[PDB]
Amino acid sequence: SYRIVVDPKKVVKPISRHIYGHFTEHLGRCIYGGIYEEGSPLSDERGFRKDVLEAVKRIKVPNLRWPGGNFVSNYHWEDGIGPKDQRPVRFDLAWQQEETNRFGTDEFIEYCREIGAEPYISINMGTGTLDEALHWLEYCNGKGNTYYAQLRRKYGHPEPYNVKFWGIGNEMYGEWQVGHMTADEYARAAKEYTKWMKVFDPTIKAIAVGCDDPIWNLRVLQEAGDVIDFISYHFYTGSEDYYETVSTVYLLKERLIGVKKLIDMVDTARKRGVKIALDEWNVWYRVSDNKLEEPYDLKDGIFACGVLVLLQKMSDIVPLANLAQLVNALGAIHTEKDGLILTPVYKAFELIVNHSGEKLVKTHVESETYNIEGVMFINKMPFSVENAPFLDAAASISEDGKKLFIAVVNYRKEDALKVPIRVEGLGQKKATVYTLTGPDVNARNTMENPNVVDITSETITVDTEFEHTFKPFSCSVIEVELE
Amino acid sequence: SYRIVVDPKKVVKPISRHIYGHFTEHLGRCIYGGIYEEGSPLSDERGFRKDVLEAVKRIKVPNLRWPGGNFVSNYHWEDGIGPKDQRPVRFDLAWQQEETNRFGTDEFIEYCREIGAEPYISINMGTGTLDEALHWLEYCNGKGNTYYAQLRRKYGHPEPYNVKFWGIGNEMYGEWQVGHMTADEYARAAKEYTKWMKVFDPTIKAIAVGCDDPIWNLRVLQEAGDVIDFISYHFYTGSEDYYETVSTVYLLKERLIGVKKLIDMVDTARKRGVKIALDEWNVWYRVSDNKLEEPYDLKDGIFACGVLVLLQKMSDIVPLANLAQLVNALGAIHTEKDGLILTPVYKAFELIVNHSGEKLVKTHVESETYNIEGVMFINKMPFSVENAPFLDAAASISEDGKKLFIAVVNYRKEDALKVPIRVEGLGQKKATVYTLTGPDVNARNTMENPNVVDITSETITVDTEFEHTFKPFSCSVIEVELE
Amino acid sequence: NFVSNYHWEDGIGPKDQRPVRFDLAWQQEETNRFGTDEFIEYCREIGAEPYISINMGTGTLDEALHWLEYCNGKGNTYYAQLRRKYGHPEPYNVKFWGIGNEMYGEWQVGHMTADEYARAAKEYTKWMKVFDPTIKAI
Numbered sequence A, B: 001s002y003r004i005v006v007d008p009k010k011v012v013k014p015i016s017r018h019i020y021g022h023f024t025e026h027l028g029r030c031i032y033g034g035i036y037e038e039g040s041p042l043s044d045e046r047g048f049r050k051d052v053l054e055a056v057k058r059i060k061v062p063n064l065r066w067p068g069g070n071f072v073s074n075y076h077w078e079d080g081i082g083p084k085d086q087r088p089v090r091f092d093l094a095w096q097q098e099e100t101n102r103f104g105t106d107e108f109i110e111y112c113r114e115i116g117a118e119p120y121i122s123i124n125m126g127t128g129t130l131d132e133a134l135h136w137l138e139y140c141n142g143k144g145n146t147y148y149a150q151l152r153r154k155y156g157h158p159e160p161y162n163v164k165f166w167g168i169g170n171e172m173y174g175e176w177q178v179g180h181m182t183a184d185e186y187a188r189a190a191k192e193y194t195k196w197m198k199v200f201d202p203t204i205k206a207i208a209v210g211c212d213d214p215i216w217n218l219r220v221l222q223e224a225g226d227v228i229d230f231i232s233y234h235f236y237t238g239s240e241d242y243y244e245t246v247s248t249v250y251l252l253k254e255r256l257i258g259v260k261k262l263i264d265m266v267d268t269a270r271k272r273g274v275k276i277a278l279d280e281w282n283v284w285y286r287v288s289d290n291k292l293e294e295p296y297d298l299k300d301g302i303f304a305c306g307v308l309v310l311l312q313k314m315s316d317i318v319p320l321a322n323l324a325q326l327v328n329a330l331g332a333i334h335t336e337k338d339g340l341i342l343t344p345v346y347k348a349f350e351l352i353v354n355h356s357g358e359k360l361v362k363t364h365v366e367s368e369t370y371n372i373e374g375v376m377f378i379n380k381m382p383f384s385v386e387n388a389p390f391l392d393a394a395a396s397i398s399e400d401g402k403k404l405f406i407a408v409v410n411y412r413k414e415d416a417l418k419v420p421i422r423v424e425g426l427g428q429k430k431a432t433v434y435t436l437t438g439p440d441v442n443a444r445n446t447m448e449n450p451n452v453v454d455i456t457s458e459t460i461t462v463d464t465e466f467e468h469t470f471k472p473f474s475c476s477v478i479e480v481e482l483e
Numbered sequence C: 001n002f003v004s005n006y007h008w009e010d011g012i013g014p015k016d017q018r019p020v021r022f023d024l025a026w027q028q029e030e031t032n033r034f035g036t037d038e039f040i041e042y043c044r045e046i047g048a049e050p051y052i053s054i055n056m057g058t059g060t061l062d063e064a065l066h067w068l069e070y071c072n073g074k075g076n077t078y079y080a081q082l083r084r085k086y087g088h089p090e091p092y093n094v095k096f097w098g099i100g101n102e103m104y105g106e107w108q109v110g111h112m113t114a115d116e117y118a119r120a121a122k123e124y125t126k127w128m129k130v131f132d133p134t135i136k137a138i
Helices: A050-059 A105-115 A130-141 A147-154 A183-200 A214-224 A248-264 A267-272 A298-313 A344-353 B050-057 B105-113 B130-141 B147-154 B183-200 B214-224 B249-264 B267-272 B298-313 B344-353 C036-046 C061-072 C078-085 C114-131
Strands: A003-014 A021-023 A063-066 A090-092 A097-099 A118-122 A165-168 A205-208 A230-237 A275-283 A320-323 A333-336 A339-342 A359-366 A369-375 A382-389 A391-397 A403-410 A417-423 A427-437 A454-463 A466-470 A474-481 B003-014 B021-023 B063-066 B090-092 B097-099 B118-122 B165-167 B205-209 B230-237 B275-283 B320-323 B333-335 B340-342 B359-366 B369-376 B381-389 B391-397 B403-410 B417-423 B429-437 B454-456 B459-462 B466-470 B474-481 C021-023 C028-030 C051-053 C096-098
Touching (some): A105 A130, A130 A183, A214 A267, A248 A267, A248 A298, A298 A344, A298 A427, A339 A344, A344 A427, A344 A454, A454 A466, A454 A474, B003 B391, B021 B275, B063 B320, B105 B130, B118 B130, B130 B183, B183 B205, B214 B230, B275 B298, B298 B344, B298 B359, B298 B391, B298 B474, B403 B417
Parallel strands (some): A063 A118, A118 A165, A205 A230, B021 B063, B021 B320
Antiparallel strands (some): A090 A097, A333 A339, A359 A391, A369 A382, A417 A466, B003 B359, B333 B340, B391 B403, B403 B474, B417 B466
């Protein structure tokens, strides 16, 4: 048996806007050819691609991370400010590219404003400096007469940017990272940058680097949990098999619950309420070059929907997440010289960001269960998840709250499910069901039939007790007025 | 608000015999004047207090921990064997008492096999050797002609004692432990002692010492997770206010979930499936001499009930547990030279051990929630626990089994709880409801009113959907037939 | 590996009073009816200079010192007096001593990190050579 019980009067928690966040690295064709193509017919006066822009605005990005990623660990921000024709051309050691630097801090901040998204920038901790990081903070944030607040104005922007999220470094644990650190080194320095940045601007929020290594997380929280706001986490998954993929959602629930408990275990961290930032996540397993153009299909898009529902459930533990990445490289959107595809990862966002609430409301959900051992990620590392649901849900309420949104995923590959839903003190009412699904589980959109996987709509009679059938391998939200 | 639904047909996972274990340390009158009083009219030929013996059998001890506790770290087991008149009188550093060693290893296996419990002995890591622990193991478990087998045999016992559980040192992390160790040096020591003890007897089960320091745990697990079976936790709570005391049940839950998560984050240990051993727990707040005669009132019996209900629900994570302690010192049982007393803590055990099943069966519960911020333990450590329930429960079945049980707890101090209970495909049966409760939260059994708090029975009827009302601050088991 | 678990005193005296132990190294009961006295007898039978390995796994500085004494002392020291008591007035004069055995490998009982071995190898040797300067230490 399956069942879903709701109560639109029992609010459990707020749901943070910023669980729906995004990410744009200078990697491959993510910026250049991506959101920003200069010579193009499809561009505007600034160089932004108008089609991509219209697509991104439909998602309504809450915040947007930049410029990396493994690019920033090697990146001097000043290289990318002022007259475009005197920006030096640099070598990006991360992804072996020439960097023209004609998309920089202003250009990026402009892109944020245009779409309506809080900028979240990451400082360079492998090649950079306290100074350089502070100077970047002054330039973006200073309202006094400091030389850098002077220089932003000099280049056309008198008002400060007030950029509230800062990322104290990127993936500083890895061999692959330029100027990579030990747990102890990084811990000591996560503290130094954070604390000094905050002296200048006590209103910024700091995300320190976390990972799977628990000793690393613990040393971070211990040294810096006095002053950080988030410890970051990275989750990439695969591969090849439907069930293996659409279930690492529950691997991620388990892994996030871990980091949360490490936080609990550290005094100053627990005391302040340090939180978790899922500041990189996606499916990735097919591609291993440095353009990362991962051909996402519907199974990947069901993983995303599952994440987003989960995040709705634990937005209090993890109030900030960023899909890696926004365009092309591991991209929800894929662009060529003359058009774009919106992958099923993207569509997942289209379904859930529109049609969802600000307050999570009590939701019991009965489901049948399974266990899987399988693989994930490019390197194939084995994983194992026991008691993964076939059906999952999270209901929410609007600020109003005369609007209930009921998000429900069906993980089943073959059988549709008839689920008896109950919603206290309601009905009867006409209501609308939005459903993201397609034919195969390997189904893609193409820039030809760019609508094989898309969001459908249909009207339904609901009441304080009703029923519904959920297509196999689909996500669907029921939207219903409560007045 | 409140609800309980049970489905006797969905077996979730088994319930381990050993969550009901106990602990018998040489501390104050716990052992001498406790279970053992030589010249006593109340004692048998070999010196076992007959009243206590029968008190103890009722509780069906699954396993008995001995001899410590902080005592073992100063303890040389050799001193405790042989004809009693030749044993040396020694000074226990742990509790500043003269130990006569008239109670030792043989007496303890007699007391164990006299009451049905598996021996579980803690070796001396603070004042003793590998060799010394190994000869202990040889003495208890050796079939062949090694000297310490021979010696067991000279003293009256041809057959091996086959002692299954060995704990590798005691609270070795603590400043108070004699020969206390750093995380790194103990982690090395755990692997070693374990490793070699399992070369002699590969069938034993070794409990490693863990604590509250996450790094401590992580190092033991990284080093010894190869060969250990359990890492151990120790929980002592209170205090003074009813709610601040009961509900640390829900502090303990969080604490334990934290530690499992540690195990998940270490490969060898995760891969081997190292579990938890709660090898020391109780209420302990109002006394800190060195006989520790805590006068437990009824709130403490309710915490015990909660803890045991919690254990039923998670005995797959924590397979083994030990109340601290059995007699006198932090005792469930209190004894004087004439009679004895059964505290509400013991009573909690009488209630659950008789009338509980061996297979946990699906138990969903809905309940109201509180947030508290209190103090706990001897030193009054501040704490809080968020969303603690006023009502909890756990349903189990006999092995066969024509008997469902429903253990349920009302933490509410003032109100009774009117609870609708559902049970799949059941009568129309009658059923007995066993309930432990007293006049007020401060109720306490006495040697002349030995019943002020006690388990009472009453017959109700159940109907696959039915209602019951649980007294305030009460624990009840509902025993229903099924055939 | 036998040695890093061995207590030399178990293999001396009347054999009937000698204790049976458990060899952790090879998982075998050891009756200790072949021991130090027995080993040196066999050595001078075949004319081989004896070469003794000391237990650094579960043994102490003291324990090793006492072995050398038993073997090489000609004073009226407890352990020399002991060798004499058991039949051998005149010392064995063993020339090659082995300062632990394979103390680097996970399999050795009592094994050490390089720093803790070098530290101890220094310490065992200097003090043995103070009792008897003629020995050669491996």
